[PDB]
Amino acid sequence: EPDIAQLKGLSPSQRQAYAVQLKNRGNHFFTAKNFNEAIKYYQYAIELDPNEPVFYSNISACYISTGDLEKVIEFTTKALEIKPDHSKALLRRASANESLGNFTDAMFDLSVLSPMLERNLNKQAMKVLNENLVLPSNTSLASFFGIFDSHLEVSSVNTSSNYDTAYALLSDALQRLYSATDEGYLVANDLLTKSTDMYHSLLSTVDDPLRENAALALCYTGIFHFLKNNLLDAQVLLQESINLHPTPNSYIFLALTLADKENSQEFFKFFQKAVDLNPEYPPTYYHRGQMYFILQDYKNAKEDFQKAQSLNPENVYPYIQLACLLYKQGKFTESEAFFNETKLKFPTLPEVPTFFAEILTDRGDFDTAIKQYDIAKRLEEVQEKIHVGIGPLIGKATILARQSSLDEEKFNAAIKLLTKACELDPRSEQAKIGLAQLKLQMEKIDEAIELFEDSAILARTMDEKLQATTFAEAAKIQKRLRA
């Protein structure tokens, strides 16, 4: 109803007087949930004092209330051109941008304004992970394959088939696998996949050596899938392997592939089948004992590990688990004594001081732990195979980075250890993320982002992939604020 032509021709206080009047009329309508009348009066007031950010801010509140998100952005942005720190215009613009799924913009305004930031950060992480949607570390693979009798595994290939044209490739794959070298795992993965493809073609005349060979290629290709976190793929081939020639490895591997934190009964059921197929196979007991260990069933873990130990006394791993059990029972001296007796029998093996270092760390005896890590690394260096990989570098770096609370040597020492670790074992998520956090503490945001991003590619689970991406997306926002 205001004659805004006439009002414009009034003195400067009078025009001011009218914008005030007209704004309040708009506020009346806004309160009466009559948003088109509200907007109309605010636009009237704007014609009389374009300089007042509250008119623009009030108009954007109207559009928040009608759902017009583009209009919220325009009007809050008009408010913020005048006064970049207007709190309601920053709050409203962040909200519209979250609604448009412009999460980084939301996060920027909420940051400038100074749980909502959390929420946009989490939505941004999932958005980038979904847009974005590799064998584990050499360290993890040497650890996985450590319990197996390599000569037994390699010799398990049958040479007596009259049709098997894949078995020499399979034997190569197994030989490479058990070499426990960087090249060894990369070549093993390739050759296993190729062997499986040839066995699938061959299977579709056949003899029992080819069928057993096939069950072996499927079994190990199956476990490679598990290791890469392709759980359906792993189950498919391990089931196929079972169909052709049931073996203890196939059951052990399928049990691991199907492990279920809710209900353990199926796992133990597979393990009984594996036991029946060969009661004298040590990896069956060692693996079952690892599960009892995970379940804190320490009595049963011990008996399984003693059993694996008696069947293969030359493998260091049953000894280690047995010493670790004494420590989890609260018998540290007995644990330490078992480690020492184990070191006497395997004085070249970095496995022993590495796992003992972890118990020392857990007790808060950090200086002894580092000494043990220093020993394991030197022992690792002298071996021809991978035993503990970069585990001693990470063990020592985590302690030094922590201890440096700033202790600037300690911090630099940790950096050089983690950089070394990332170089020697590039597929290690743990070494990258660990470095990324230090880079970020040094304010090396660009380097940190790249590290977090690689770590997300390398991570196995969704949850780990999303943790990594979240760190990277947080850092990109910090980089934008500093930009």
Partner: peptide
């Protein structure tokens, strides 16, 4: 004062 309010 808060967001659901005009000024």
């Amino acid at each position: 004062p808060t967001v659901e309010e005009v000024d």
